[PDB]
Each structure stands twice: as C-alpha cells, then as structure tokens.
C-alpha cells in the first residue's frame, strides 16, 4: 500500500552519540540508525478498564451517538538499528487513533 | 493426584520459600565469593527468566563453553562454604514454625518432601475441588463423555478455576462430547477471555499462574489462541471440496484483525497457520476449477478469470510462507510445500 | 420504575444513582431514555 | 442537577425563539474510565416547521 | 467496620443468628416440637450469661465453627434424640446445617459489619480434627455446667443400634456389647456426657462416652469372636461379612460417608476418592450440582466480570446438556441376606482383617487419632482386667 512505500522512502535518521572511545575521534564509532519498517492500521476497537477486557468492534453509529471521533489504532514497526547492524531492535509502537474512512478497507462497514 | 485449580493456601509455603531462598542467596554468595520476600525477588534477578515456553531449551549446538574445573568439590570445600550460611538461617529458623524448622533442615540436607502441599490443605471448598479435578482426569482417561462433562461443568461453578485445565480439558471434553459445542466457541470465548494484549513477564513471584498455558498478549503466545486457529482450519476442511459458507474467510479476517501486535508481532504458525488456511483456499479453487480441465471439456467460459484469481493467491501465499521463514521460523519444511504447490500448479494448467 | 434502554442490546433497565452508566446485559455505554405513559395535549394541526 | 459546593438544585435552561419537543435523551458514560455519575447527556429537540409566508420554495 | 467491644457485640449477634437458623432446620429435619427449640435457646442464653460477666474487654468468646454444633449436640443430648457421628455425617451429606458457610446470616450487612477480629472468621473456616470435635463440647460443658443442668448425658441405646446395623448387623452383638457395657462400662450404667473440662489444656481423659462405646463395640467383636469356643460364628462366616461389606452404594448414607471422606484427611478415604465405584462417581456429581450451588450467590466489576461469567456458564450450559437406587434398610436387608448362609491362624487374621475395617468406619465419622482411638482402646483394655 502507498503508506508502506512512503515509510520505505523516508529511510533512516542517523545519530552519533559522539561515540567517545578514546579515526576514533572523528570517526566517532557511535552509529545509531533509526527507521520505520512497517506501518499497520487496525479497525476501530474499544477495550475498557484497559486490556483485561473483552474487545468489541466499534461502529460508526457509536461514534456519532457518542459525538466522538471514529479512530483506529495506528501501529508502526519501529526499527532501532545500532552500529549500522551491530544490533537490531524491533518495536511495534501504537501511535494513537488515526481516523479511518467509512466503507474503506479499514471500516467495519 | 492431579493439578489443582487454585492459589496455593498461602500460609506456610510462603515462609518456607523465604527460608529456601534466603539460604540460597547466603550459600550462593559465599560461592560467588570463594570464586573471586526481596531475597526471593533477588534470586530471580540473579538468573533471568524462562521466557515464552517452559524449559529454556535452546539448541545444543553453537558455543562450546568448555566446562571442566576438575569437579572442584572436596567435601572439605563444601563445608567451608556451608558452615556460615546455616548459622544465619538459624536466626530466622527460630522465628519459624516447628514444621518449617525441619522442612528447612530436610531441604538443607538435600532431602525432598514426599508430603505434597496439596495433600493436607483442610478447606471445604478446596478439598472437594481436589476430588473433582481428580474425577474428571480419571474420567477422560477412560473417555466417559456423559460424566466427564458433568464434573467439568461443576468444577468451573465452584470459585476455583483459572482457565487452567478448563481450557485444556474444556476443549478435550467438547471434542469427546459428540453433542453440544465446538471447543471452537469455547476456544473463541477463551481468546477474548485472556487476549492479555499487555506484554507482562518477570517482575513479581508468579506462583499463582505459571503455566505458559494461560497468559500472553504481550509477546509470549497464548496456546489456546493458537489452538483456536488450528481447530478452526480443521473445522473449515471437513466437508469442503469433498453464502452460508464464509468460515475460510471468517478465519482470513479474524487472523487479519491481528496482523502483528502480539501475534503478528511474534512470528510463526501465526504467519504459518495463516498461509496454511490460505493454501487450502487455493486448492478448493483449483478443485472448483480442476477435474478434467476445470470441471471438464475446457472453459471457453470467458478467459479463466478463475486462473488469475488463483495465481494471485498462489503468489501471495508464497509471500506469507517466505516472511514466516525469514523472521526465524521454527516449523515449516519449505521443500515439501514448494513441491506440493508446483505440482498443484500443474493441475491449474 | 424509571427506564433506560441499551443503545445496542435493546434490553430494558432501570438505572440508579448507585450503578455504572452501562448496559448490564451487553456492556454498552449509551442508553436511550425510554418513553412512558405521560400525558401530552396536542392541537390536531 | 445538584452541585454539593452550592447546595442548590440547578437546571440548564432552554433558550430559543420557539418551542420544541424532546425526541431522544441519550446517557453517555462512554469513552470514560468510570465517570459513573452520568455527566454527559445528549438531548434532541424536535422543532416543527409548518409552511409559512416567507418560507422559500 | 467496627473494632473492639461493639465489633464483638455483633460478632456475638451474628453467632446468635446462625445458630438459630441451625436450630430450625433442626426442627424441620427431626420434627421435635417446641421442646427441641426452647431448650436450645436457653442453652445459649446460659452460654451468653457467662460471656457478659468476663466482658470489660473480654474477647475470648467468639465461638469456633464447632461450638455451635456442640451447643446443638448438648441440647439434643438433653432431649437425647440422637448421636454424634450420625448427626455429623448426615449434616455434612445434606449440608443440613448452614454450618459450612457463614454468608447466610441475614447479614449482607453483618458481612460488611467488617470483620473486627470476628465476623469474617465466622461461618465455614475448616473441617474438624481428631477430638477437636469435642475438645470444645467439654469446654461448653465447662462453660455450661451442663451435666448438673441436663439429664442423661451421652447415652442412647440408639447409637448401639446404629452401630450394629452399621454393618455386621449381628443382632446378638447389640446386647453382647450392651452386656460388656453392662459390665465394667461405668458400673453397668449409661455413660453420661463428660464434664466441663474447665482447664485449657484439654487433657485426653477419654471421658467422651461414645468414644468409649465404640471402644467396647470393637472389643466385644474381637473378644466374642476370638473365643466363640462353641464355634457359633463359622470360620468362613467372618470373611463373608467382610466381602459383602467392603463398599457398595447407599440409600443416601454411604453416599454421605463418601462426602465426609472427601475432607481428604489422613488418606483412609482418599483412595476411595480415586476408586469411587462408578456411579458413586455419578450420584456424587448429582449431589454437587444440587448442594454445591449452595456455593456462592465478582461485585461491581461493571457487570463485566460477572456477565462474562454468565456467558461462560451459558457456554458449557449443560446440567443435562429401580426410582433407581435403594434406601438404607433395603441395603441393610440385602447384605444381611448376602450372608444368608449362616446355618487357626487364618481366622485370627480374618478377625484382625475385619476389625481394621470397622476401625475405619467408626473412626472415619469421628476425630479418629489413628491411635488415640486405640489410646482409647488401650485405656479400657486396662480398665477391664480388674475382675
Ligand atoms: Zn445492551
């Protein structure tokens, strides 16, 4: 999908901790490459009291009656690459509720 | 004799633990040296956790950590380490019950207790429950369906059931119960009854629910949720290809509602089971367009729109099988599935 | 008995100042206040 | 409603040029963590509009 | 939520309450008119008398789970309607008593009356160990000065009957044992309930009359059987009485004794647990689906935790996703017939074989002491040889 191509195009954001090491003084030796591999979107759900509850599908009728937004959990697989590959870290981070379009591939209808 | 549904009468067992650990950190320490409540939490902080399974089984082939150190145990050397931790166990041994004094003096000699803590508890509610948990297990060990169901149904109405054997004998009794229910329903009720989408491991003394057989929704798979999907694909297979259908789609959309977080998030059968449901959806469509060129003499029947719908799928399923391998798979014998899929493609020609 | 219908299960109920604003039969958090036998006059135009 | 700080029975008045009728009253505890006091209510007013001189057609 | 004296007053009150509920089921089960009811009242009126006196801030009272039945036991003894072991087994089997769980009350509120070193400890804490059952009956007699107040304590020619029918209904053994009782059993006089063991050490003086009745019962069988010189009881006859017995259904009774066995104590019935003769298995689950419901009713939980629960039960729904079994005297008759055939080292072994069995039975209804029992046995053994 277009969004995964977009995140494949943003690439990396590199930062060097000023790798002290005591080339090791102008080649640092402190590479940190941060990127985003995947981006996932989930259909609207609401769990109350937090987690320990049974989840229910959230419908547009609910968002209208409640006079609230119709949000889907936005998740994105964060890639935390250390020393250009010395250490790879994956994390699925939840980025709050992205409003989903009705009758789209992300609305229950 | 079998595993009981309840938090273990927390009375003497909790102070026996104190004395066990406190001795192990004392004796352990003076070893750690001669090689130069909290104390139970510190014991677990001194050797990590077991993760998502049972026994930190991991290979047998990589690092040859050459372990020799000649044995290093001169009866004389053990009693140098031990002579001081035992006198420091006394001070708290005094403050402990006469039963826990010798319980400690037994395990510090290396004797093990033939007195199962679950063979003494004296509580009304409890003890019955031991009778029911044992009756049900003796009734499935002879397949008594009509009686195992009654004991199971009473066992959960009594206040002492943590999914436990309820999810592991509650599906076994509904497969053996030729009558009402598809472990499935019960399996899908469980899935919603402990998604535990929260990544909780380690920290506190899990001694109320150890069993990687209830828990998860963090990382550590749930095995009733994996069994729900496996039982669901086997429930789709029976009498397909032998609008009220949907099931093989219901399972494509119920596994998609996931698409990693905890399950997608973690790899394997999640991906693999999905592809397997997807691979079955490819056959069924080759059958429904197979026998003697589709059904028979040709198709003329506009293009083969049906071949293109199937080749799209076959190409997709090879993507799901590949990402399941790449991400460290643990169960797909790729050679056989690729040969089956190519020979099955031959049918589509 | 005052009445409140669950917006999603249709189950009638009678909320009190001492209960959670939730459908006790489904778990919904939206309740339609039920109509009752209450007199209203109307000019027929 | 009643606020303990004011020890008074207060009301939200209806302010309009014309009368209406209450069509639906919906009690909202939703999106809340507990909020059991039922502090959000949605009230729908029905205003009938008879064709009248000056109405556009 | 009350601590101290008034917390105690309602802990007192609640105790007051459940005993009364206990007594009225008492009447319905036994239909023993005003009489059973009023004697029981004043008994506790008498018990209350002393509690007030050592008050000030005396909190030694809060009676144990057992004190209540000791009270009903003492009062019955007055009336001398029944027996202890029988009463206890019957009560457990049918949950006749509200004894097991203390949620009943009329408390809802007494429940919340917080616990205050009390109310929570009441109703259903644990099942009795050894004497322990009486280790308080004596104390109550102590509090009560019961023997002076009430006539004929511990007695019952009915416990003997209960016991002979209990198994080897050997009609003759009723007055065999009645005779040895006649003998040195308190100078041929009906054993009265022991005294008000005032002392807190609760020494094992074994004056609990029944305990001795069972002892004479066992002894009688052994002696009489040991020396039946005339050979009135055939070699092959003794084991037959054993083969016939070793288990079987029960027109309610044996099913009950299974339910008591399931306090899984010293492992004498534990294995019965294991074995549990087929149906015994079945009528067990029946009695669990009827009398375990007397189980319970999480609170609040937004209906949520509860609903889910309801659904789950909706799920396994179940409870059905010669009237066959027989009565007590039917079973009794049929094994008395199963021995229908009446008219060295081995028999001694068989006799010991049989005595262990009864030791199991009589001991199992009661506080046992896989040796006090015999300590008890030992005692009168000694008592006897002063002819
Ligand atoms: Zn509802």
Swiss-Prot record, chain A:
It is found in: Nucleus, Nucleolus. Signal peptide: none annotated. Belongs to the RNA polymerase beta chain family. Component of the RNA polymerase I (Pol I) complex consisting of 14 subunits: RPA135, RPA190, RPC40, RPA14, RPB5, RPO26, RPA43, RPB8, RPA12, RPB10, RPC19, RPC10, RPA49 and RPA34. The complex is composed of a horseshoe-shaped core containing ten subunits (RPA135, RPA190, RPB5, RPO26, RPB8, RPB10, RPC10, RPA12, RPC19 and RPC40) where RPA135 and RPA190 form the DNA-binding cleft. Outside of the core, RPA14 and RPA43 form the stalk that mediates interactions with transcription initiation factors and newly synthesized RNA. DNA-dependent RNA polymerases catalyze the transcription of DNA into RNA using the four ribonucleoside triphosphates as substrates. Component of RNA polymerase I (Pol I) which synthesizes ribosomal RNA precursors. Besides, RNA polymerase I has intrinsic RNA cleavage activity. RPA190 and RPA135 both contribute to the polymerase catalytic activity and together form the Pol I active center. In addition, subunit RPA12 contributes a catalytic zinc ribbon that is required for RNA cleavage by Pol I. This is DNA-directed RNA polymerase I subunit RPA135. It comes from Saccharomyces cerevisiae (strain ATCC 204508 / S288c). The gene is RPA135. The chain holds residues 59 to 172 of 1203 of the full protein.
UniProtKB/Swiss-Prot annotation, chain B:
Acts as a component of the core factor (CF) complex which is essential for the initiation of rDNA transcription by RNA polymerase I. After binding of UAF (upstream activation factor) to an upstream element of the promoter, CF is recruited in a SPT15/TBP-dependent manner to form a preinitiation complex. GO terms for molecular function: RNA polymerase I core promoter sequence-specific DNA binding; RNA polymerase I general transcription initiation factor activity; TBP-class protein binding. Its main location: nucleus. It comes from the Eukaryota. It comes from Saccharomyces cerevisiae (strain ATCC 204508 / S288c) (Baker's yeast). One of its GO terms (cellular component) is nucleolus. Component of the core factor (CF) complex, which consists of RRN6, RRN7 and RRN11. The CF heterotrimer may further dimerize to form a hexamer. RRN11 interacts with RRN6, RRN7 and SPT15. Present with 476 molecules/cell in log phase SD medium. GO terms for biological process: nucleolar large rRNA transcription by RNA polymerase I. Keywords: Nucleus, Transcription, Transcription regulation. This is RNA polymerase I-specific transcription initiation factor RRN11. It is found in: Nucleus, Nucleolus. Pfam families: Rrn11 (PF04090).
Swiss-Prot record, chain C:
GO terms for biological process: nucleolar large rRNA transcription by RNA polymerase I; ribosome biogenesis; RNA-templated transcription; termination of RNA polymerase I transcription; termination of RNA polymerase III transcription; transcription by RNA polymerase I; transcription by RNA polymerase II; transcription by RNA polymerase III. One of its GO terms (molecular function) is DNA binding. It comes from the Eukaryota. Zn(2+) binds at residues 6, 9, 23, 26. The N-terminus is blocked. Keywords: DNA-directed RNA polymerase, Metal-binding, Nucleus, Peroxisome, Ribosome biogenesis, Transcription, Zinc, Zinc-finger. It is found in: Nucleus, Nucleolus; Peroxisome. Present with 907 molecules/cell in log phase SD medium. Belongs to the archaeal Rpo12/eukaryotic RPC10 RNA polymerase subunit family. DNA-dependent RNA polymerases catalyze the transcription of DNA into RNA using the four ribonucleoside triphosphates as substrates. Common component of RNA polymerases I, II and III which synthesize ribosomal RNA precursors, mRNA precursors and many functional non-coding RNAs, and a small RNAs, such as 5S rRNA and tRNAs, respectively. RNA polymerases are composed of mobile elements that move relative to each other. In Pol II, the core element with the central large cleft comprises RPB3, RBP10, RPB11, RPB12 and regions of RPB1 and RPB2 forming the active center.
Swiss-Prot record, chain D:
It comes from the Eukaryota. It is found in: Nucleus, Nucleolus. DNA-dependent RNA polymerases catalyze the transcription of DNA into RNA using the four ribonucleoside triphosphates as substrates. Component of RNA polymerase I (Pol I) which synthesizes ribosomal RNA precursors. Besides, RNA polymerase I has intrinsic RNA cleavage activity. RPA190 and RPA135 both contribute to the polymerase catalytic activity and together form the Pol I active center. In addition, subunit RPA12 contributes a catalytic zinc ribbon that is required for RNA cleavage by Pol I. Three distinct zinc-containing RNA polymerases are found in eukaryotic nuclei: polymerase I for the ribosomal RNA precursor, polymerase II for the mRNA precursor, and polymerase III for 5S and tRNA genes. Present with 14100 molecules/cell in log phase SD medium. Belongs to the RNA polymerase beta chain family. This is DNA-directed RNA polymerase I subunit RPA135.
């Amino acid at each position: 999908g277009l969004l995964n191509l977009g995140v494949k195009d943003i690439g990396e954001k590199v930062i060097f901790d000023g790798k002290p090491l005591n080339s090791n003084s102008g080649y640092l030796g402190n590479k940190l490459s941060v990127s985003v591999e995947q981006v996932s979107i989930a259909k609207p759900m609401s769990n109350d009291g937090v987690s320990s509850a049974v989840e229910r599908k959230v419908y547009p009728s609910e968002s209208r009656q409640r006079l609230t937004s119709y949000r889907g959990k936005l998740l994105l697989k964060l890639k935390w690459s250390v020393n250009n590959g010395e250490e790879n870290l994956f994390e699925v981070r939840d980025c709050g509720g992205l409003p989903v379009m009705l009758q789209s591939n992300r609305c229950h209808l | 004799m079998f595993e009981v549904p309840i938090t273990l009468t927390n009375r003497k067992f909790a102070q026996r633990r104190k004395l066990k650990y406190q001795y192990i950190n004392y004796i352990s320490r003076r070893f750690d040296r001669i090689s130069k409540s909290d104390e139970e939490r510190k014991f677990w902080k001194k050797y990590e956790k077991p993760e998502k399974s049972f026994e930190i089984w991991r290979t047998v082939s990589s690092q040859n950590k050459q372990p020799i150190n000649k044995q290093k145990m001169t009866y004389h050397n053990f009693k140098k380490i031990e002579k001081i931790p035992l006198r420091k166990m006394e001070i708290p041994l005094l403050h402990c019950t006469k039963e826990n004094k010798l319980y400690f003096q037994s395990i510090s000699r290396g004797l093990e207790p033939l007195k199962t803590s679950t063979s003494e508890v004296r509580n009304y509610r409890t003890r019955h429950i031991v009778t029911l948990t044992d009756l049900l297990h003796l009734n499935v060990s002879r397949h008594n369906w009509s009686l195992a169901y009654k004991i199971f149904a009473t066992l959960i109405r009594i206040p002492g059931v943590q999914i436990k054997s309820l999810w592991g004998i509650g599906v076994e009794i509904l497969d053996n119960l030729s009558n009402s229910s598809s472990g499935l329903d019960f399996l899908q009720w469980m899935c919603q009854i402990y998604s535990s989408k929260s990544r909780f491991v380690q920290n506190i003394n899990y001694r109320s629910i150890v069993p990687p057989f209830q828990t998860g929704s963090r990382t550590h798979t749930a095995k009733f949720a994996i069994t729900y999907l496996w039982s669901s694909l086997i429930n789709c297979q029976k009498s397909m290809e032998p609008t009220e259908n949907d099931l093989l789609q219901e399972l494509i959309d119920k596994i998609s509602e996931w698409v990693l977080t905890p399950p997608f998030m973690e790899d394997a059968e999640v991906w693999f089971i999905y592809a397997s449901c997807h691979l079955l959806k490819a056959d069924t469509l080759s059958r429904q367009f197979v026998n003697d060129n589709k059904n028979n003499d040709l198709i003329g029947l506009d293009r083969d729109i049906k071949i293109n719908q199937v080749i799209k799928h076959i190409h997709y399923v090879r993507t799901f099988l590949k990402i399941c391998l790449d991400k460290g798979g643990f169960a797909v014998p790729s050679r056989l599935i690729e040969n089956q899929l190519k020979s099955f493609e031959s049918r589509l020609y | 008995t005052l009445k409140y219908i669950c917006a999603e299960c249709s189950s009638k109920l009678s909320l009190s100042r001492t209960d959670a604003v939730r459908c006790k039969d489904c778990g919904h958090r939206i309740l339609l206040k039920a109509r009752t036998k209450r007199l209203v006059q109307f000019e027929a135009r | 409603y009643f606020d303990d700080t004011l020890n008074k029975t207060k009301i939200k008045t209806y302010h309009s040029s014309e009368p209406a009728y209450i069509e639906e009253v919906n009690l909202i505890g939703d999106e809340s963590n507990k909020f059991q006091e039922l502090q959000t209510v949605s009230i729908k007013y029905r205003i009938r509009r008879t064709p009248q001189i000056g109405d556009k057609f | 939520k009350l601590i101290g004296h008034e917390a105690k007053l309602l802990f007192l009150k609640s105790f007051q309450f459940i005993l009364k509920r206990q007594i009225r089921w008492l009447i319905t089960e036994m239909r023993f008119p005003k009489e059973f009811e009023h004697v029981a009242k004043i008994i506790w009126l008498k018990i209350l008398k002393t509690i007030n006196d050592q008050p000030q801030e005396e909190l030694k009272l809060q009676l144990h789970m057992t004190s209540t039945i000791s009270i009903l036991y003492l009062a019955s003894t007055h009336l001398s309607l029944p027996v202890y072991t029988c009463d206890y087994i019957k009560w457990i089997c049918t949950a006749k008593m509200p004894y097991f769980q203390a949620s009943e009350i009329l408390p809802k509120s007494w429940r919340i009356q917080l616990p205050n070193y009390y109310v929570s400890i009441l109703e259903g804490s644990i099942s009795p160990f050894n004497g322990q059952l009486y280790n308080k009956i004596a104390l109550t007699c102590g509090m009560i000065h019961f023997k002076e107040f009430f006539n004929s304590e511990i007695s019952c020619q009915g416990l003997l009957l209960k016991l002979v029918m209990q198994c080897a209904l050997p009609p003759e053994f009723y007055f065999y044992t009645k005779q040895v009782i006649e003998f040195e059993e308190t100078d041929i006089r009906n054993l009265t309930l022991w005294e008000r063991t005032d002392e807190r050490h609760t020494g094992r003086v074994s004056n609990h009359a029944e305990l001795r009745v069972l002892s004479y019962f066992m002894l009688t069988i052994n002696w009489m059987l040991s020396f039946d010189r005339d050979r009135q009881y055939p070699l092959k006859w003794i084991l037959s009485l054993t083969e016939s017995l070793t288990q079987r259904t029960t027109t309610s009774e044996s099913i009950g004794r299974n339910i008591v066995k399931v306090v899984y104590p010293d492992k004498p019935t534990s294995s019965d647990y294991f074995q549990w003769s087929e149906e015994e298995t079945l009528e067990f689950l029946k009695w669990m689906e009827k009398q375990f419901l007397p189980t319970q009713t999480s609170m609040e939980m937004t209906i949520d935790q509860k609903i889910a629960r309801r659904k789950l039960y909706k799920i396994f729904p179940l409870d059905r996703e010669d009237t066959h079994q027989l009565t007590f005297i039917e079973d009794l008759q049929e094994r008395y017939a199963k021995q229908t055939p009446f008219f060295p080292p081995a028999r001694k072994e068989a006799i010991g074989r049989l005595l262990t069995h009864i030791a199991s039975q009589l001991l199992v209804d009661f506080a046992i002491s896989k040796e006090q029992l015999k300590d008890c046995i030992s005692r009168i053994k000694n008592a006897c040889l002063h002819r």
